[PDB]
Amino acid sequence: AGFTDYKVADITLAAWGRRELIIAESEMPALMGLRRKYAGQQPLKGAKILGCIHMTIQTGVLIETLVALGAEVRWSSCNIFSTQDQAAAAIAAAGIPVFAWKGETEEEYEWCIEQTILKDGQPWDANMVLDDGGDLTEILHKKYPQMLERIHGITEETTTGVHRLLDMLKNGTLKVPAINVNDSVTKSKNDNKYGCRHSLNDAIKRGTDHLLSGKQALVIGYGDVGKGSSQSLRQEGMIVKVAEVDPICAMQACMDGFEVVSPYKNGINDGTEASIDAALLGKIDLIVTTTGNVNVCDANMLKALKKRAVVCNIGHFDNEIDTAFMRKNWAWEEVKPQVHKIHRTGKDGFDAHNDDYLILLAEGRLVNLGNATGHPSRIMDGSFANQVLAQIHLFEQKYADLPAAEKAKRLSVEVLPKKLDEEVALEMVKGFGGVVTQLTPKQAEYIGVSVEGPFKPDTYRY
Amino acid sequence: TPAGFTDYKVADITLAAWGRRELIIAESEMPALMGLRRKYAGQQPLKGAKILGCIHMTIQTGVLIETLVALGAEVRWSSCNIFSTQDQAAAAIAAAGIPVFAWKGETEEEYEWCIEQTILKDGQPWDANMVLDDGGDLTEILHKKYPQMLERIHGITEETTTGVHRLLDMLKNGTLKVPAINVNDSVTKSKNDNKYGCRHSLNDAIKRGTDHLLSGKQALVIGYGDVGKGSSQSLRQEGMIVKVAEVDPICAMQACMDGFEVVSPYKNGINDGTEASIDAALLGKIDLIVTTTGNVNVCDANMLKALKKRAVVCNIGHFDNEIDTAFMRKNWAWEEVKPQVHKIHRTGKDGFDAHNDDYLILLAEGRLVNLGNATGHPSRIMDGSFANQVLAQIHLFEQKYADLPAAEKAKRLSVEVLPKKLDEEVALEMVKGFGGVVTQLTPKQAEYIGVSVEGPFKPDTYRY
Amino acid sequence: FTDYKVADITLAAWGRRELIIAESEMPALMGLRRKYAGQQPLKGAKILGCIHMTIQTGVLIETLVALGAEVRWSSCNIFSTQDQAAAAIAAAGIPVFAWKGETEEEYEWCIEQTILKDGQPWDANMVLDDGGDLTEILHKKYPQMLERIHGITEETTTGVHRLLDMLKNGTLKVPAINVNDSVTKSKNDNKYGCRHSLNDAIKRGTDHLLSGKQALVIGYGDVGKGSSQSLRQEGMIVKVAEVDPICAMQACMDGFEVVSPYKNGINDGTEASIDAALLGKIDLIVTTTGNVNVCDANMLKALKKRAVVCNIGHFDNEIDTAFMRKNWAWEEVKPQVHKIHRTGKDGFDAHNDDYLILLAEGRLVNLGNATGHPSRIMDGSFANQVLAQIHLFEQKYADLPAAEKAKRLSVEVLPKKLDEEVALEMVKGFGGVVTQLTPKQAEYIGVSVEGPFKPDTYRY
Amino acid sequence: GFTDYKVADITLAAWGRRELIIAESEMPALMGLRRKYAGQQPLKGAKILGCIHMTIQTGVLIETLVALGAEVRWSSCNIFSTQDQAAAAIAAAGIPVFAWKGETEEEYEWCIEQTILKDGQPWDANMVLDDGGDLTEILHKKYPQMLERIHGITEETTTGVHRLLDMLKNGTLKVPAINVNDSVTKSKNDNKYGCRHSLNDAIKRGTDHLLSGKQALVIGYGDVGKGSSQSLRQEGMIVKVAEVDPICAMQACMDGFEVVSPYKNGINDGTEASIDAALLGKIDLIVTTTGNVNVCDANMLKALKKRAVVCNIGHFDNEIDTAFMRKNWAWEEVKPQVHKIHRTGKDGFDAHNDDYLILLAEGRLVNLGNATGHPSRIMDGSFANQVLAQIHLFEQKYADLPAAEKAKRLSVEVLPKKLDEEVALEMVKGFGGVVTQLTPKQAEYIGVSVEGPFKPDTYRY
């Protein structure tokens, strides 16, 4: 009542969002377990969290868990297409500041982040940051250093954001410590891999309703996202080829039953059209970029792709695909929101029955969130249980209140302890109805662990 | 070849020409190992090395042995398991003039005697200066029984998870006398050999031992580490309905996401020692149990008593004590079907009825089943592991730990892994052997993600 | 042009964009347009059509029209229409009566609107049907219209069954072609189509993770085979129920555990007969049988809390949804997704944990909660439909003498050569290359180089 | 003093018996018939000439026929498919069997002749069980007087049925036959899932090659090609499929395989120029599954990637042009049923030559040649059908009918669906599966009897 401190597409979607949040709570036992465990302790009482992450139903359950543990938040999405408008509405209607809708312009995206940072035109009294991709983190360091003086930490969701943090640390420009949430095993080897397994073919089906069985796919990259993406397509019956620059990841692709190829002859990308394996790309029906790198589906690749191939990206940022080239040279025909036919016949107009087009999904933005709903609740449970534990840890450490000599000793980018990683995993397993076996004292002694764990040395790769 | 060569003990020297035929085939399947031969033969980096080697005497180990020799080493060899030798591999190596003491079907006494025949030459300690081990038995015998020989040894290169665990325990207790390289934890070993090797060779061994249809039947895999992951896939890809047990909730999470039901042999996961804690309804439905843990007594006597009639029991971890075979020897009658395949009649100890329906089928007497009942991992997978072995041997031999003063020795007494750059170079040769084409980063791309164009491509923290 | 009724005519441009995409996905059907356009084999045909008004059906409709036909069209399910497809067809001046979310009364009205033109029966002479509802209405309510109709081409397993029952009973009035049992229909559409579209519909309705959860698929015919694969490939632990031991054998060999909801498989009506331990572990039940009450009231009571319940057979009586309407409280999550609260009939607690999630109110879930089968699969089914329409229309049964009619009153399938010719176009659509026998090789196996390559008994 | 047999080594009998006793526990449909019909002795007076792979599984079939009252004289239908411990155990039981692994072609013919002749004269045979048609052909060509007294042939496999149908077409078939192959519990169990189990099995035993990540080309996508393709894909091979039948090719595409032809545009015109050399030069493994002739021809063999494996899982070895390889290339035996074929010439080879192919089982049925064929629990279905087929034709007593009645009965038929379903039910119970029973209302609703059959005869499963 009287609450106007938000901006969403349609507040009347709130009841629908609330119904979906109630379903999602039953799919997120690790997060709901954190709510029950810590609600009395209120470990986030006094925390004021700036949050920048895809404003989905799953993020709604994360926000309400932080709030239930005592935090106040101000929220935005980290992508212009990833918000679920009913989730945003349900959060705003609960009295929580959120600035997010599906289909933002770049200008609106920046404005939404700014509305979390500023309250009534002045810097909010923020003391914690939760980020996915590093955009909020970057704006705070470049534009609001006085705010970082009073911030105790950053908890960063995703591979790309972690890389940006490590670059700041290397350069001496990171102002507050961070937890790399991505590299919990219950994040990286759950969300990044199995989440894309679930949601990649999901988004492609919703966008195009194409049969995938029997068609040819090229997955660029075979890290955690590339592994999950390749499985998402292979399990549908696609004939999947994999490209990689890392020979260890390429080895895994071979042993997993994929043919490893390069878009470039002998894998040498010298910028000429002559370097493109036109015979290979002329047979590809679907290309997916998974790298976190720049220009891995480039202009000459796009020119050589089979007519009517689908082009999409599931890495964090759209510059994996040279969409700028396509905006400059080719005519875009909107099929429906986040689905565009790109006519390679020219820039000025198109024939409605032209056969020489590509289908681009989500304008090159994260395709699982742009054309579907991203990862499912029961996977995001893992990632967001880690986020909550990381917020608790850094808020309780109170870095901003430390003397300068003590700050220097704690300015780092760290992961959560393996014991907590395991405790999140156990809640996930119980959610499936799995029954973990308890070591006898002799067995725990034999392999050199405590019965309650941790069960593996920190070097273990799973 | 050498005139009058008698410094070996194998089952049947007439298998040597067959073994050599298979070695020549394997060379074509092991491009990383054969690349090291081509790259380093001229340099002879192992000239002067005298390697004690203890690892399964397979055709794949033959190619490893002849790679070490080609690079300048002398070796004396034994198997690290009583059932894992391929007799034609041992024969071909002996016929090449290489001391080898190994045959399929050793007794435990013969197994120990074979290791001692590598340690000893003409009744006295060989002047060994390198060790290559798989599981730590030779490492243990040297420390326990021949500690003075370790004064001349520059390093141990240890193949497998269990062996590394034993080394780390020695290091922490102050009992390890020479530095070691953990070959297991190269990604081109652990995430190639331990996983994909078992995927290939578990169902292979079960088929050769039993010729049982696997499709449609119920399996329980104990463990979901690298071997458990590969083993579960070996069975699921055949159409088994696979359930997975784990103590590690992270590994259990992966099993659930990989499409397996995660269960415990014990009610609520709690073993209280009693038969009442066994989930007898679960175990009464299981057609196949596979242990993969590297732990002790994970398929215990009460589980064995509860298993479905005519279930197959096997172990693919390094040591046989994963299964309580001792209980079965004490209480139940063993009927050999053929070598390494026994029906174990639960009707009693003394005799058995030839037509009794209440038996279990034990493979390889509970020893590593892929090597006991088939041929272990294929050459193209062992290529990764054994390329790492050669590089580790070169590294420790060139470091010359035994020649350092006692102060410098304390600084280098460690258990280390190979650097990621080398791991990557092994993988690249493996990928090329499949005909795969790795893409080269542009300078701008390499700058963008913060790597060199030549690698390494991942931080040391990366888990693949 | 006002001779239509759709949800929103302004969706026409969107539907037309998707029809142009779908044409590129349907080489067999577009090949028929190109090859028969000159002949106009359906010139003079007036086709009553009743099948899911999807984008794929739009390409079928426009193929029939391109070959000379006139049509009047309705959907064969209340939830399966894609409104943009219906709009695009209406905007092309083709009469269609169909929208997503019809009531049962509106569904019947829509069929009647195809049957009647300007308050009088249309001079129809052909029928295209999916499930047999239009066939049934013509026989029961408008039998004199059947005196001018040359044949029926029936799409699906349930409709074929209904045709054979009338043939057996002497009540079928016109000849029919069983389109379902072309191999490029039954062993393409019924199986692979459900493989594509079942997990699709479950994700769109619930966004549930499927990996690691327990499913029970009731049935293992073609739909059950495809459905089981749809779930297993996502990582579900899939159990299968069957009454047919041969289909059950296939499930075992395919790597599924075969179970019954009933102790020892005996469904004697009592709660005591339910395997409550089994059902208490199931996260998802999918019915695929074309039978009645295979997910019954006692099974629904025993199911794990928050399990998903859906049906991908033709009719919603596979699940006892009437029991649930009578006894439990329905909370709509969003269209075609309902939480059914087992706490009672009148009202519910918004935070109650004891509910089931029913998709599409028990109607065909792939069409109700997603878009049904993809264009490239429907290409096979609808190429057969066009060929079957050409064949019956040219036979001109309604014009034959009575004794000539008695000899042609049957339910037939298309010849194998045509089945193979559809398959060849589908294979070419994937870039596949079929090998041609040498004369010696064809002699050796006793076939012609042209084919057909298999005897009519071959099961593929 | 039983001497009416010839096997490799009779001392293998005890080992064979141990394996028969295990296989009995894996064959519930077949052992179910043994228990059901033992008292009635429905094959009393039957005298069966059998020609089928002398495996442990065939051992259980033979002893089921004998337990039901039959006498038999047995041979293998392939020179490499016998399991010598199975043959020894059968001989040691007093059953005439002439079979060993590694027969020459002359010995193969001699073995069949030893079943046909007893003490130098025609045996008083009155039934035939065959797998591939060689025994059936010899009887028709050489022993027509014996066929006058034979009541029927029960034929196991696709190729043998084709041969029967050709004879029926030509009016040369002299006795009726049951096509056992086309029971669903045979064709869609044995032909498909049996090859799924045993193809990668045989390749591993012959070569120990890693299959994951390598390229395979499967020629054919019928029942054997479907199972074979799955055998390789499930191991992680990248599997391409060739077909002449566009419906089978459509299935391969929808099952997630790339469909390719060895020949450019699929046109096999006999020229080297017609070979897709780029494709063949990428293939690590080629498997023929067709029942056809020369589907892996000389020009394909010349074009294959160095060190590719070549094998055949169709009934006969002429699927591959091995004659060409014998005539032009040097053969190096690696071990029994594994040969390197050196494409450098005919007159000897270099032991370190890199340009060779690996041929398994000299192109004969590779699952049986290099491993043990299908597993017992799959063969259970096929051989339950064989037993039922033998009972049916023996009880019809065709040989004793008047000429006019023979004419009405001379046919090639399948077993009725009710039997096919009952076999399937015993197989499902063997897995612990529980089939649901229709209610009366449900049976009425779909128009079937509660006991079945549940499908019309047109149903394809």
Ligand SMILES: NC(=O)c1ccc[n+]([C@@H]2O[C@H](COP(=O)([O-])OP(=O)(O)OC[C@H]3O[C@@H](n4cnc5c(N)ncnc54)[C@H](O)[C@@H]3O)[C@@H](O)[C@H]2O)c1
């Ligand atoms: N859409 C989602 O829901 C989602 C989920 C998790 C992460 N992500 C994002 O996806 C991206 C990848 O994440 P990750 O965890 O898999 O990282 P990763 O480091 O595990 O994998 C990236 C891979 O790309 C490869 N690569 C780099 N440049 C390449 C090139 N030119 N050609 C081919 N391969 C190349 C690398 O070798 C590496 O193996 C990041 O941007 C991450 O933030 C997205």
Ligand SMILES: NC(=O)c1ccc[n+]([C@@H]2O[C@H](COP(=O)([O-])OP(=O)(O)OC[C@H]3O[C@@H](n4cnc5c(N)ncnc54)[C@H](O)[C@@H]3O)[C@@H](O)[C@H]2O)c1
């Ligand atoms: N046979 C082969 O070819 C082969 C190859 C590689 C390694 N190995 C051997 O296999 C064993 C396992 O190796 P790994 O690399 O997988 O090790 P790992 O540590 O990766 O996996 C062992 C797993 O067992 C689980 N576990 C332990 N005790 C358990 C119990 N009581 N119940 C259930 N799960 C339990 C652990 O949680 C762990 O995840 C070692 O002995 C190793 O030397 C064998």
Ligand SMILES: NC(=O)c1ccc[n+]([C@@H]2O[C@H](COP(=O)([O-])OP(=O)(O)OC[C@H]3O[C@@H](n4cnc5c(N)ncnc54)[C@H](O)[C@@H]3O)[C@@H](O)[C@H]2O)c1
């Ligand atoms: N949704 C779709 O897109 C789609 C596509 C094709 C067909 N269908 C419909 O799906 C249904 C099934 O079609 P089909 O082609 O698979 O038919 P089918 O005859 O091939 O299979 C139905 C199966 O259900 C089994 N069954 C019957 N009663 C059972 C019971 N009580 N418990 C367990 N199993 C039982 C039968 O034994 C049979 O194998 C029909 O209604 C058909 O019209 C739907």
Ligand SMILES: NC(=O)c1ccc[n+]([C@@H]2O[C@H](COP(=O)([O-])OP(=O)(O)OC[C@H]3O[C@@H](n4cnc5c(N)ncnc54)[C@H](O)[C@@H]3O)[C@@H](O)[C@H]2O)c1
């Ligand atoms: N080894 C075994 O255990 C085993 C088991 C069953 C059958 N078989 C034998 O295997 C063979 C195949 O049996 P099936 O049941 O699969 O028969 P099938 O008729 O179902 O399949 C053979 C397939 O080969 C295809 N084909 C023919 N010539 C071809 C060519 N030149 N190129 C590509 N494809 C071609 C046909 O179109 C057909 O689909 C027969 O000889 C049969 O007797 C062997």
Ligand SMILES: Nc1ncnc2[nH]cnc12
């Ligand atoms: N559903 C989701 N919600 C929030 N962040 C995500 N990242 C990937 N999927 C997501």
Ligand SMILES: Nc1ncnc2[nH]cnc12
């Ligand atoms: N094991 C086996 N025994 C007999 N015939 C077979 N055909 C295929 N496998 C067989």
Ligand SMILES: [K+]
């Ligand atoms: K979601």
Ligand SMILES: [K+]
């Ligand atoms: K091996």
Ligand SMILES: [K+]
């Ligand atoms: K569709």
Ligand SMILES: [K+]
């Ligand atoms: K066998």
